[PDB]
C-alpha cells in the first residue's frame, strides 16, 4: 500500500501519505478556538501524520461562515495552541490554514455591517448561497473592490498571521488561494475585471497570490508554507476561461518564488473537479476523469517540489495517485470528519462511517463532531 | 398511498409503482426479441403501467447497442407480440421514442455521417458512449441541422408513433429528456443557435412543442406522455435557468392540451437529485430545497398527471404520493432487480441489488430476466 509507504516533506518525516483536509466546521464560537476543536483534531491525529485546519481568518473582515476560528489576535493564539499542543503530542505535523473568503461573505459577518472586500464589484450570482448564522440560506451582497494599499494591507494580514500561527506552535501554515474565495477572485478572469496592475494578464491576475506567498515566505521562511489553489473548480462562479494555462501560470511563480528564495514550499495543494456518476442515466456510470488527471498531473509534473491531490479521493484513488506518481500525498475531507481513525481504517481497508452532511456547519462541540466512532 | 387507484385518462391503474424506460440492449440488431416479452411479463401487473426502453424513431436515433426500432414494419411486428403478452397479464404499456442526437458515435450511423444536433458542439471527453464491442468509446462532432431538417425530424416521431399504435401500444412517451435531440434544443448551455429555435426561451421550447404537437395530431393528446429534465446533469446538459425552462416547456404543453381538447397522457419529470460540488465549502448549500421546489413548482404548473422519477425508494415514493408531489412514480434499477417489485413494495419484502455488470450486455438473460421472485 503506497499510502504507507513514508516521506520527507522537506524537514517533516511522514510515515504515511493520508493527510486531513482543510474543512470548515464552524465550532470555534465567536471566532475562538474551542476546547472541542482540540478533541477533534486529537481524534484524528497519528503518529507521522500530517493535518491541516479549518480555514482560519487572517482579519476582522476575511470570514464568510460563522464561527470559525482566526488567528490574528493574541486570545486566539493561547488557545490554538492548546490544540497545537495535543495534536503534536501524538506525534503528528500540523498547519493553519489561512483563510480569507473577499466577496462570499455577507453584511451579517462583516465589522459595522459593512461590504465585503474582492477584486472586483461583481457580486456572486444568485445560483449560490451562504449560510446565515441562524441556518438560513442568504444571498451574496455586492463587494467592494479595493485598491493597491488596501491590497498590501490584506497581505500584511497574511504576514502577522503567519507569524502569529508560528508563535501557537504550528509546523507551518497553507495559504488558501481556492474554491473562488478573495485569492481565487484575483486569480479567475471570470472574476477579476481589473484594469490596474492586479487585471487583465495572467501575470497580472497572479500579482496578489504571488504578493501573499511571497509575504509569508519572508516572515517564516518557504519550508513552513502550503499553497492550495483550484485552477478547475468554479465554486462560488469563479471559472477561468483557460484553467491549465492559469493553473501553469500560477505553478511558474511558485517554483520563481523558490528559487530567488533559494528554499522550496511545504508543498502545493490542488483540489480538483471530481463530478460524480449518476448511476439513475443511461451513460452516468460511462465517463471517464481522464481529463481531470491529465490536468492534475500536469500541474504536479509542472511543480518543483511537493504535490498533495485533494477532491473526491478514495482509498482506492488515494493507492492510485501515490502509486502512479500523480501526487505525494493525499488529503481527504468528507471521509474525515465521519471517520476519526480515517488512517487506520484506510490501512485495514475497512468499513467507512458515513458523514452527516447536515451538522458539517452546526456548533455543537460533540454532536455530527467528535461522537463519530472509532473501529471496534 | 402507493397502491390507491389512479385513473390516468381512460386507464384506471391499480396502484402508482411505473416501470421506468430503461435501454437494456437485448434487442439484437435493433429488433425486439423474445427477451423483452419475458422481461416487461415478469414485470408486468393488473392495472400497472409500463413504459419500454427508448425505441428509435429512424436509423441515424441510436447512441447505444442492440436497441429496439419503431422505424420498420418487421420491428412493428415483433412489438405486437409483446405488447400481446404484458396486455394479457391486464397492464399498461406506453413505447419510448428516442433520438440520441449528438450523443451518438458513428458505429450506430448509417451512413457513417455525423450525430444530428442543435449544434455542432460536441460533447466533452469526461462522457463516453458504449461500443458494440462493450468498450468505451468518444463522442464525435455533431452537425447543425437547418430549419427544414428540423420538419423531417419531427415527422420521424409522427411516423414512430403511428408505428407504435398499429403495434398495440396504448400510447407513446417522448423522450425529451438527460440531454438527448429534444433536450439540445432545450438547453441553453447546448442551444447556441441563431434561428427561430435558439435564442429567446420560447425559441428553444419550439421544437419540443411541434415533436408533442405532431404526435398529438397523429394518434391523439391521450396517448402521448412527455418527459424532460431541466436540471439534469448527463451529457453536457446545463440550462441557466432551470425553472424558467420547466414553466415555459408547461405553459406549451398546457396550451397543446387547450388547443387539441384533450389531456396529455401524462408529464414524466426526472429529478436532479444534485450531488455536485460536494467537495467544496458551499457548493451544497440550498441544494436539496431548491430541487424540492422545482418539482413541485412544475407539478402545480401541469394541468395534469404528474410522474416523478430517479432513485426513489418505497419510502420516497410514498412520501411523494402522501404529499401530493406526484400522481405516479417509476422506478428503475430497483425494477431491473426486482420482477416482482409492485408485489415487493406492497409487502415491504427484502429487495435484490441491481448488478450494474449487467445493465446492458446482450445475453437474453444472464442479469435480465433471471431476478428471482418473492
Ligand atoms: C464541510 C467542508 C468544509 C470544507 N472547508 C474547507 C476549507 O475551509 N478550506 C479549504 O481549502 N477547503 C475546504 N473544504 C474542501 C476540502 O478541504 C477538500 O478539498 C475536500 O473535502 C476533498 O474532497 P473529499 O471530501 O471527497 O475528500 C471543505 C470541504 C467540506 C466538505
Ligand atoms: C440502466 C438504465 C437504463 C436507462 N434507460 C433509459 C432510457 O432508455 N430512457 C429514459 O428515458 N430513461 C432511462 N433510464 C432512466 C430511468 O428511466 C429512470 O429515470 C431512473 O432509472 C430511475 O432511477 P432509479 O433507477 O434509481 O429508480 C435508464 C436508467 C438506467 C439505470
Redesign the pocket.
Given at each position: 500500500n503506497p499510502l504507507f509507504s513514508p516521506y520527507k516533506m522537506g524537514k517533516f518525516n511522514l510515515s504515511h501519505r493520508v493527510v486531513l483536509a482543510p474543512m470548515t466546521r464552524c465550532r470555534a464560537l465567536n471566532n475562538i478556538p474551542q476546547a472541542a476543536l482540540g478533541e477533534y483534531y486529537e481524534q484524528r491525529a497519528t503518529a507521522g501524520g500530517f493535518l491541516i485546519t479549518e480555514g482560519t481568518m487572517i482579519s476582522p473582515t476575511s470570514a464568510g461562515f460563522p464561527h470559525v476560528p482566526g488567528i490574528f489576535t493574541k486570545e486566539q493564539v493561547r488557545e490554538w495552541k492548546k490544540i497545537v499542543d495535543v495534536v503534536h503530542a501524538k506525534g503528528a505535523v500540523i498547519f493553519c490554514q489561512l483563510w480569507h473568503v473577499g466577496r462570499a461573505s455577507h453584511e451579517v459577518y462583516q465589522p459595522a455591517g459593512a461590504a465585503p472586500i474582492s477584486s472586483t464589484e461583481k457580486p456572486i450570482s444568485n445560483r449560490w448561497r451562504i449560510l446565515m448564522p441562524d441556518g438560513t440560506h442568504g444571498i451574496y451582497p455586492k463587494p467592494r473592490a479595493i485598491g493597491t494599499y488596501e491590497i498590501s494591507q490584506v497581505v500584511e494580514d497574511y504576514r502577522r498571521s503567519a507569524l502569529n500561527a508560528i508563535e501557537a506552535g504550528f509546523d507551518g501554515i497553507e495559504i488558501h488561494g481556492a474554491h473562488g474565495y478573495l485569492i481565487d477572485q484575483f486569480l479567475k478572469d471570470g472574476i477579476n475585471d481589473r484594469t490596474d496592475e492586479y487585471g487583465g494578464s495572467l501575470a497580472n491576475r497572479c500579482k496578489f497570490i504571488t504578493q501573499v506567498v511571497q509575504a509569508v515566505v519572508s516572515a517564516i521562511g518557504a519550508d513552513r508554507v502550503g499553497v492550495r489553489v483550484s485552477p478547475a473548480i468554479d465554486h462560488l462562479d469563479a471559472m477561468d476561461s483557460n484553467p491549465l494555462s492559469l493553473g501553469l501560470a500560477v505553478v511558474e511563480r511558485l517554483n520563481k518564488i523558490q528559487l530567488h528564495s533559494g528554499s522550496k514550499l511545504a508543498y502545493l495543494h490542488v483540489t480538483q473537479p471530481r463530478y460524480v456518476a449518476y448511476?439513475?442515466?443511461?451513460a452516468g456510470r460511462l465517463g471517464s476523469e481522464e481529463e481531470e488527471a491529465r490536468l492534475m498531473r500536469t500541474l504536479r509534473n509542472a511543480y518543483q517540489g511537493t504535490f498533495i491531490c485533494s477532491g473526491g479521493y478514495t482509498r482506492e484513488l488515494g493507492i492510485e495517485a501515490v502509486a502512479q506518481g500523480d501526487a505525494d500525498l493525499v488529503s481527504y475531507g468528507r471521509l474525515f470528519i465521519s471517520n476519526p481513525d480515517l488512517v487506520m481504517r484506510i490501512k485495514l481497508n475497512a468499513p467507512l462511517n458515513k458523514p452527516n452532511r447536515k451538522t458539517f456547519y452546526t456548533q455543537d462541540p460533540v454532536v455530527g463532531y467528535t461522537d463519530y466512532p472509532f473501529l471496534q
Open positions: 448511476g439513475q442515466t443511461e
